[PDB]
Amino acid sequence: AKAKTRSSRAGLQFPVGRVHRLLRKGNYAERVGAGAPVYLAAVLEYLTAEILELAGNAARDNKKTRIIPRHLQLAVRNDEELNKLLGRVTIAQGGVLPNIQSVLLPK
Template structure:
């Protein structure tokens, strides 16, 4: 018969109960310092069934090649000039003092639009 501590460890699935809190997950794009999303490229590689298996390094390498081509190839850079990559680039860090007050924004949204704004300019 097993003692109760062994049962508790099995129920914890590799983590001790009451231990340190679980760390926040870090994406593979952040680890590789890439703007292109590695997880999304992996999903497309698997869904496209280009091969039976997709290794761990394949989407990272593919994302880095795509990012390099988008940055360095002039024709491709012109083609992708207006494209916005979801969750890509630098995160906004705006000082809270520069943002408008929530109370002022809520009061401004309650006003009805004026007649001049409702007309279309023709």
């Protein structure tokens, strides 16, 4: 019969066969269920969509039509939840968030 992928019949875009393959041959457990790849693909897709939307917002805020590591840095550090999740990472070529202490400004 004609074959349709688990990604399609699950509604997602991220791959489910690849996730299942990694979970199996990743020495995570002896035997792997049949809904875990779907759940993991859904979660990864959600996180990717969230950060990408914030990055696109920043990119258009700077009048540009291509997301760059600077915009990734800016979105991640301006959203507090993603900032906590990615608190310990350092996006390469991301620069720093603009900030000058109030005391340092002139009178």
